[PDB]
Amino acid sequence: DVNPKAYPLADAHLTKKLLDLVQQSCNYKQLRKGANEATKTLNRGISEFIVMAADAEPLEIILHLPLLCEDKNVPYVFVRSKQALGRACGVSRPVIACSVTIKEGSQLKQQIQSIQQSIERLLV
Amino acid sequence: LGVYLTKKEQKKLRRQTRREAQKELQEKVRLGLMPPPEPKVRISNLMRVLGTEAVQDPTKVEAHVRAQMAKRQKAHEEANAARK
Amino acid sequence: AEVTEEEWLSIPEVGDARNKRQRNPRYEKLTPVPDSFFAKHLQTGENHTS
Amino acid sequence: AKLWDSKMFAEIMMKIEEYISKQAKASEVAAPEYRVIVDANNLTVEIENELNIIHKFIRDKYSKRFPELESLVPNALDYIRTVKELGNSLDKCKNNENLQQILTNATIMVVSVTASTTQGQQLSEEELERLEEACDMALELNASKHRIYEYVESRMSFIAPNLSIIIGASTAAKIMGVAGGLTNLSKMPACNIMLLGAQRKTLSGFSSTSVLPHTGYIYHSDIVQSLPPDLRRKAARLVAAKCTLAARVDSFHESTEGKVGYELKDEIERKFDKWQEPPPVKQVKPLPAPLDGQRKKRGGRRYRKMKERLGLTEIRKQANRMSFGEIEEDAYQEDLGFSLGHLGKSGSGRVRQTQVNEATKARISKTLQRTLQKQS
Amino acid sequence: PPLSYKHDTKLLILALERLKEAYSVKSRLNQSQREELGLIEQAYDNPHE
């Protein structure tokens, strides 16, 4: 709505599950906050997906992440409010981009995969 | 949508609630609605709290301190059971 | 004499750069020397018989 | 050889792509300018890699003549200029006026000292000519790089308007050149952009802080260099972050006038002002009045522990007891005012030795423990 | 200094003794002196670390 460019935007139902998973990953220390950390994880090839916010006045500051994702074959999704994403990330300050990282034998695996599928079901 | 809170806010909220409860109990004691708290005595704490009186009759002191410990323990257990 | 009244109004209050730990430091408590020092001093001075 | 192949490839690239860049530059002095800009900003990386190959070959050849200058001179281009000004002649090391403009006086001394008693044999004529042609081609490619950076500085108003607004145009051109392109720089994390062009300057016995390591082209920019040194590094980081944003905008061609550039530069100036702001007015605490009467202080486990820590120990209690009449020889040459008293003295009333109260053991603070654990 | 030096311990003991002789007579110690003594004693208890 406010961000018409955010083609892969999640609905209200999906945002709750996304933020719950982000908070759980933060509990397990499987989350990286900020665009720079997401880019670092993508380059390292340790991330699995990126959750980004659609509210940012210099919006293109996040636009580098999707293309790099297409370079690294990683799903990405957009969220409405950056404050809610930051609260889910465990940071009071607004966060516009976060990444979820792979750990060997992680208990979140299945949930991760489930959300992954949803993103592929959201794309077009 | 439901919103989470950072660990800092969780710690601050828990600390504020605990301080509120402690101030509530202390001011209840101030106004006479609550008896002044008794020292918490265990086996190690026995000779420090009731040292001048345990020599009078040690077995009664042992019974009293064990009764206090069991009262605390059973209060914890009944709180758990009621919460079940 | 050439300074205008507005320029007089604009002089800023002097501020102190050092923070709390230097302006009003906490009391520097003193402690006795550890007994290990006396132990070492007394152990030293002992002489081997050979 | 490797030098011949690299030189041939560089000449082939310069005859076509560098010539196209020259025609594009001379035009302003359907084939849009964008492809020329992109091919130039890829040519910079191509020539950097071929110059790295040239520098490796020169290092391999000169190791026979001088197997130490590699560690002494870390910069590749500085290495090439140094070997150009040295060659087989190492006795030239004394008072070289040409070495001053390339190497700092700190390392000219070191290279002269090393060349005084080095084991490198003198090269033959074939090695000399091979190395000379290698150095000539390397300097020609360096001149080409300088020209293409001048071209990118000229095109700064078109390629990255916001990022050219934030920092110096020369710095912007250099960072895009070392990064590999506008898109390549925009994909880099902010913590990495500030490390672009950070030469591994060797410490010549000085501290690492004198070297100023982990300092990039952003650290040497116009705005960052206009700050006190204690405020420099932090400033660089800030600029880098904002620079990244500009790239992440400029790579998608937004605010070509530079509105994001101003919207970032004004906040950069605001942060700099806040960091440089005069300290606020802080009132001094008057000394507390002397105390009288009684103040109720609690007891308990903490009080017991503190009393044990600060209490008089048996050995300390026996230390300040001095035997009357019986004079003791002073066992401390460095100070006659120190004695153990009854401790170790006859008539002390202790047949056995007074043991050490371990409650008075000396131990570090909590923060010192934390720092030690970090430094482990 | 190798990891398997025969005299790796005697030198540390001598260095610690030399550092500790700064307070052989100091009846009172401030925070800096007590931190220094704590570091000396911690290094003396675990020479390998």
Number of H helices, E strands in chain D: 18, 0
Q: How was this structure determined?
A: cryo-EM
The pair of structure tokens assigned to C43 is 């152990």
D228 touches chain C (CB under 8 A): no
3-state DSSP assignment of residue D342: coil
Angle between helix axes A60-72 and D232-250 (nearest 10 degrees) is: 70
- The answer for residues whose C-beta is within 8 angstroms of residue D156's C-beta and 6 or more apart is D164, D169, D172, D173
Could you tell me whether strands A47-53 and A76-79 are parallel, antiparallel, or unpaired per DSSP bridges?
A: parallel
Sign of torsion, CA E25 E27 E30 E33? positive
SS (H, E, C) A74-118: CCEEEECCHHHHHHHHCCCCCCCEEEEECCCCCCCHHHHHHHHHH
> What 8-state DSSP symbol labels residue A49?
E
Q: For residue D194, give the nearest of D246, D239, D250, D251 by alpha carbon.
A: D239
Cβ pair D315:C16 closer than 8 A = no
Into how many domains does chain A fold?
A: 1
Computed over its alpha carbons, how large is the radius of gyration of chain B?
Answer: 19
Min Cα separation D273/chain C (Å): 16
The domain in which residue A90 lies consists of 1-124
Assess A91–B contact: CB distance below 8 Å, yes or no. yes
CB-CB under 8 Å, B8 with A92: yes
Q: Is B31 on the interface with A (CB under 8 A)?
A: no
CATH of the domain at A62: 3.30.1330.30
Residues in chain D within 8 Å Cβ distance of A67: 187
User: Closest Cα of chain D to E40: distance in Å?
Assistant: 9
In a mutagenesis test of the C interface, which of D230, D281, D307 is the best target, namely the one with the most C β-carbons within 10 Å? Answer: D281
Q: Which residues contact residue C25 at a Cβ distance below 8 angstroms, ignoring those fewer than 6 apart?
A: none
CB within 8 Å: E27 and C32: yes
Chain A residues in contact with B2 (beta carbon < 8 A): 16
The Cα-based distances of D290 to C30, D287, D293 in angstroms read 20, 9, 10
**Residue D336 to residues D58, D330, E25: CA-CA distances in angstroms?**
69, 6, 10
Tell me the structure's resolution in angstroms, rounded to a single decimal: 3.7
Distance from CA of E20 to the nearest CA of C (A): 9
Inter-residue contact A65 to A38 (CB < 8 Å) = yes
Matching residue, tokens 């410990």: B69
Given a contact cutoff of 8 angstroms between Cβ atoms, the answer to whether D268 and D223 are in contact is yes
